[PDB]
Design a protein around this ligand. Structure first.
Ligand code: HEM
Length: 152
């Protein structure tokens, strides 16, 4: 549950992402894959990537980063009223992709890391607080759908 002022912070931060969605999306996925190599194994189309240089050179990885952040941005712009947008993603990630909630924690922290890396000194403590709460809400509502489905 976020206040209006917290949502305003989230959507202000998101403007930084929308200025370069593919570059942010690329770095988020690279941070996930390099920090948690078991996550790469869930992607049949990226498992061939052995080095970070290959990851950086991959145009399909940048494309998928755009898909991921476009979906997340659409959810964030709903300011918590995201049941219709979140349900299909929860269902596909639990039932088709088999993504444990832990990996959603990993990608949430990766987003925070990338924001500080690309905007050092320009991602203030209030902005980090609000973005973290928004990603916690996203993860928590996914977790509720995972429990419904019995998925671990
Ligand atoms: C911010 C969190 C994330 C969002 C918004 C997101 C969004 C998406 C979207 C929009 C798709 C394509 C449509 C679909 O299949 O439902 C997708 C596919 C997928 N996602 Fe995610 N995802 C997230 C996190 C993750 C994580 C952490 C993993 C694994 C570690 C993952 C694994 C996958 C896989 C394996 C696919 C299919 C890729 C392919 O072969 O085309 N997702 N995701």
């Amino acid at each position: 549950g976020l206040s209006d002022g917290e949502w305003q912070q989230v959507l202000n931060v998101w403007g930084k992402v929308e200025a370069d969605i593919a570059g942010h999306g690329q770095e988020v996925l690279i941070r996930l894959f390099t920090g948690h190599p078991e996550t790469l194994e869930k992607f049949d189309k990226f498992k061939h990537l052995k080095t970070e240089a290959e990851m950086k050179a991959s145009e399909d990885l940048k494309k998928h980063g755009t898909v991921v952040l476009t979906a997340l941005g659409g959810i964030l712009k709903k300011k918590g009223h995201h049941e219709a947008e979140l349900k299909p993603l929860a269902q596909s990630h639990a039932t088709k992709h088999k993504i444990p909630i832990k990996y959603l924690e990993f990608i949430s922290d990766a987003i925070i890391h990338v924001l500080h890396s690309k905007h050092p000194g320009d991602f203030g403590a209030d902005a980090q607080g609000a973005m973290t709460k928004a990603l916690e809400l996203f993860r928590n509502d996914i977790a509720a759908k995972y429990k419904e489905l019995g998925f671990q």
